């Protein structure tokens, strides 16, 4: 479940960070979005705003919702597996061979491991360095 | 289902009677601590009370007042009364006489509580209106007395809140 | 049914029942089991339906006043937040604001009695006070009304702490609020 969930969060986190980085604000959105220099700047920015604790609330009610499932599992009174929330509305796997969706989780897992190392330098890189398509640092020059 | 008339929603009170001006409306349940002739005699006490201090209070601010005027006693709204007949002494000529009804009355309710047949709030003083009419009528009129004392509780209320809120004419 | 409708991918509340009005099998912490300090689906039927209920006047309310002005012999308050608003009659004419108070509590004191006694007895039944009571019909109408009536409960209730929420902030009223998004 972790695993999953961290892979599923690390590949979202990725995506925007990017997308921002390329400048893609919210459709309609404000002053408060557009004047943020950098994603490494967002966050504090953001949280300033207020707009993080919003999304904190948002996110709980969901954690919520969604976490009781695995009492019930341990109480041995449901059959749900791991990851499985029954969401799939454009139907990618309905009806489809196991083998088939097994192969599908697996990529799932395998570009969510790779997400969750990724962030790790779209993290650390860019601290110590600067933002950028590569996001390197300054090797002769000072990183922190 | 034995719902009281005054709350639909609720269930009749047990241990009340079907005396006049029973309307079930007893949410909090008195009447299951203390005996319902006692409680009777209070409300009715409180009205008669409240009624006669509904009159005088208005009238005396109106302007209605005894001629030969006592020291004082003038240029005084009922609102400051109190004080001056404290002071002349009439509060305390009243505060005799009705104290020592009102130890008549112990002995009265005592004796009701124990049986001897005393209506609750009867003195035995009718003027003659009830004589002679049956007990429709005599009923009628109890509940009539009921309903007016009732109401003057809560005019009396709001005459004297209002008044020392407002000071102000009889209209406040 | 081994799955709930709001929630696919977890089991049923037990419990509630889709003939409850207002069912949708949404109880993922299953608060509907409990029954202590004096709490039990009974209290909780009563409670959704009556703070639906308030919500939903508090925010035609605002709303009224924000949209039409105040009422005949209010016109100190003039702000449209409706949160000063408050305060400006509050320190004008404190009297009616804090006699309603008086009488609501009394109401409410006989009501947690009824309820009381009623979940006790089976007499009553949650939300039942008698307003009304003949208006519905066929029962098939009641059931329907009734379901209306947590939905848009259940909608109000958002609305509102937003109202609430929003005015103590941007100390602007609510319609103007929308309009400036909006603009
Ligand atoms: C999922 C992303 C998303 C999408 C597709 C849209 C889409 C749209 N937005 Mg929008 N918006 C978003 C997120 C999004 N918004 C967020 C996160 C904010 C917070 C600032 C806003 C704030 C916002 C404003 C303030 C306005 C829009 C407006 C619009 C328009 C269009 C339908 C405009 C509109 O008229 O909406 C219909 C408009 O004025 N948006
Ligand atoms: C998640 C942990 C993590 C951490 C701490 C770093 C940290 C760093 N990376 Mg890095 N990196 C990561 C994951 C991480 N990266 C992943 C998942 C990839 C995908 C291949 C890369 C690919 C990568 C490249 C291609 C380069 C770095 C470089 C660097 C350094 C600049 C910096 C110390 C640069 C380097 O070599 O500096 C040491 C560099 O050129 N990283
Ligand atoms: C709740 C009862 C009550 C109390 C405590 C007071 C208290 C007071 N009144 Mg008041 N009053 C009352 C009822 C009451 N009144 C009623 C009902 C009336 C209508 C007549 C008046 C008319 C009245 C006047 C005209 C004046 C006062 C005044 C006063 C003050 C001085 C006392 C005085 O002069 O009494 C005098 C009281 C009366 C003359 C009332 C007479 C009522 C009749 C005669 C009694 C009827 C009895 C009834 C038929 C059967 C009952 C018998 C038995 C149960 C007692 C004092 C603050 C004086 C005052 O404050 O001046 C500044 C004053 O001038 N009162
Ligand atoms: C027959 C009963 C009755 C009637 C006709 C009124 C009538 C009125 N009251 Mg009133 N009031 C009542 C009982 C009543 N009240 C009771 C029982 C209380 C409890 C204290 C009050 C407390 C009260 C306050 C505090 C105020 C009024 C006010 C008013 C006026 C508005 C209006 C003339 C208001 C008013 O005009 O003030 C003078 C006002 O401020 N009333
Ligand atoms: C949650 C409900 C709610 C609350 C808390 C308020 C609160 C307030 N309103 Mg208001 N209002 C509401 C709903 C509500 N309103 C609704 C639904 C409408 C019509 C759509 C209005 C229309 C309205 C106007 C037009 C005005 C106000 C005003 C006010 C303010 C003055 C207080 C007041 O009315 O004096 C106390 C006096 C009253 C409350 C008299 C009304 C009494 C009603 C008729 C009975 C109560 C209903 C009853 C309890 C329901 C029974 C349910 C249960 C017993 C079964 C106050 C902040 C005034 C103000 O200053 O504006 C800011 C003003 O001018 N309101
Ligand atoms: C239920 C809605 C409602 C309606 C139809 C009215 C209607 C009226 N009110 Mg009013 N009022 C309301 C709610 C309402 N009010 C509330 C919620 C409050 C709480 C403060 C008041 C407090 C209030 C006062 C203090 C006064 C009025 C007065 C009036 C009358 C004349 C207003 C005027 O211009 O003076 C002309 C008018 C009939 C005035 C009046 O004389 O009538 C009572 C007046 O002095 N109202
Ligand atoms: C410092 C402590 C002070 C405590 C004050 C005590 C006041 C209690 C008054 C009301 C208690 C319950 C009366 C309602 C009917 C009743 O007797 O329930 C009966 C009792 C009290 O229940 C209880 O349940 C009533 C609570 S609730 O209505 O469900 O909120 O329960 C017996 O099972
Ligand atoms: C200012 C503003 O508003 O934004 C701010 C907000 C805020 C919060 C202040 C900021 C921050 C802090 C952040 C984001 C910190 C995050 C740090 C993070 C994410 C740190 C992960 C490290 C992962 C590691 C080390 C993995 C190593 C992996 C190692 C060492 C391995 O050996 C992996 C491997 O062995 C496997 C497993 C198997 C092998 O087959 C393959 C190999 C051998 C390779 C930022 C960044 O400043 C931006
Ligand atoms: C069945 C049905 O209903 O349909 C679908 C519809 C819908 C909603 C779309 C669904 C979906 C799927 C979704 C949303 C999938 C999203 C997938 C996503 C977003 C996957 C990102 C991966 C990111 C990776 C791999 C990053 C690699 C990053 C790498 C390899 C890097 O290292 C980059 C690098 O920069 C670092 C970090 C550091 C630098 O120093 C070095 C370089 C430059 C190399 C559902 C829920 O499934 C249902
Ligand atoms: C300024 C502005 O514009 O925004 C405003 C909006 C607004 C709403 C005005 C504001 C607010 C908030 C407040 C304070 C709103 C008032 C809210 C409140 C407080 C509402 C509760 C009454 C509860 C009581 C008395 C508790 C117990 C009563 C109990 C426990 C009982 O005895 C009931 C009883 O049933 C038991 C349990 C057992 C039964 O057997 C017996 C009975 C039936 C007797 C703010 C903060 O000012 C912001
Ligand atoms: C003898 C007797 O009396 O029997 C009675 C019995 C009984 C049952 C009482 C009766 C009834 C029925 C009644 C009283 C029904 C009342 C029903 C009612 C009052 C139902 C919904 C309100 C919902 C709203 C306002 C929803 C959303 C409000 C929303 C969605 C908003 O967005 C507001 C908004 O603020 C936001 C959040 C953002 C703001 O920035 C801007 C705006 C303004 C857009 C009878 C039949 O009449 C007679």
Same mark, same amino acid.
């Given at each position: 479940?972790?695993?999953? &969930?961290?892979?599923?969060? $690390? ?5 925007? !960070?990017? $997308? ?6 919210? #459709? ?24 993080? !604790? ?6 709980? +009610? ?5 976490? $009781? ?15 499985? +929330? ?5 139907? +990618?796997?309905?009806? &489809? ?7 599908? &989780? ?26 950028? +398509? #590569?996001?390197?640092? #300054? ?6 | ?14 241990? *009340? ?5 029973? *309307? =079930? ?64 002494? =009439? ?29 609750? =709030? ?9 004589? =002679? ?40 | ?50 703070? %639906?209920? /308030? ?9 009224? /006043? ?9 016109? %100190? ?24 108070? /008086? ?81």
């Amino acid at each position: 479940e972790a695993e999953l &969930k961290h892979g599923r969060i $690390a590949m979202m986190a990725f995506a925007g !960070w990017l $997308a921002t980085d390329f400048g893609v604000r919210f #459709p309609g959105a404000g002053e408060p979005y557009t004047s943020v220099p950098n994603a490494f700047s967002a966050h504090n920015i953001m949280v300033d705003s207020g707009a993080m !604790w919003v999304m904190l609330s948002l996110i709980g +009610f969901i954690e919520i919702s969604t976490a $009781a499932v695995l009492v019930e599992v341990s109480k041995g009174e449901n059959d749900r597996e791991a990851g499985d +929330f029954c969401f799939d509305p454009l139907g +990618f796997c309905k009806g &489809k061979s196991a083998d088939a969706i097994n192969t599908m &989780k697996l990529k799932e897992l395998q570009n969510g491991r790779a997400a969750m190392m990724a962030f790790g330098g779209l993290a650390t890189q860019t601290a110590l360095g600067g933002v950028d +398509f #590569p996001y390197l640092v #300054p090797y002769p020059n000072v990183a922190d | 289902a034995e719902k009281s008339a005054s709350l639909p929603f609720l269930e009749a009170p047990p241990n *009340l009677d079907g005396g006049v001006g029973d *309307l =079930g409306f007893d949410p909090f349940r008195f009447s299951d601590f203390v005996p319902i002739d006692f409680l009777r005699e209070a409300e009715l006490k409180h009205g008669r009370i409240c009624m006669m201090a509904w009159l005088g209070f208005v009238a005396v601010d109106m302007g209605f007042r005894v001629y030969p005027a006592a020291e004082g006693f003038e240029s005084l709204t009922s609102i400051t009364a109190h004080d001056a007949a404290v002071e002349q002494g =009439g509060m305390s000529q009243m505060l005799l006489w009705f104290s020592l009804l009102e130890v008549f009355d112990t002995i009265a309710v005592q004796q009701m509580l124990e049986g001897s047949g005393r209506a609750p =709030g009867d003195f035995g003083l009718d003027g003659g209106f009830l004589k =002679g009419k049956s007990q429709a009528e005599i009923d009628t009129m109890k509940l009539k007395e009921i309903v007016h004392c009732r109401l003057a509780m809560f005019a009396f209320s709001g005459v004297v809140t209002q008044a020392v809120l407002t000071q102000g004419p009889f209209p406040y | 049914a081994e799955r709930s409708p709001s929630l696919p991918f977890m089991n049923k509340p037990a419990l509630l029942d889709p003939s409850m009005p207002g069912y949708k099998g949404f109880d993922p912490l299953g608060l509907s089991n409990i029954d202590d300090v004096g709490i039990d689906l009974y209290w909780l039927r009563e409670a959704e339906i009556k703070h %639906a209920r /308030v919500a939903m006047l508090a925010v035609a309310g605002a709303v009224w /006043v924000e949209a039409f002005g105040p009422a005949p012999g209010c016109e %100190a308050a003039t702000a449209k937040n409706q949160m000063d608003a408050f305060w400006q009659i509050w320190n004008s004419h404190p009297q009616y604001i804090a006699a309603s108070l /008086v009488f609501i509590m009394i109401a409410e004191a006989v009501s947690g009695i009824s309820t009381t006694t009623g979940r006790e007895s089976g007499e009553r039944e949650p939300g039942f006070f008698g307003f009304g009571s003949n208006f519905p019909k066929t029962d098939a109408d009641m059931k329907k009304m009734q379901d209306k009536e947590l939905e848009n409960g259940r909608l109000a209730m958002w609305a509102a702490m937003g109202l609430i929420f929003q005015g103590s902030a941007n100390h602007m009223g609510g319609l103007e609020a929308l309009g400036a998004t909006f603009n």
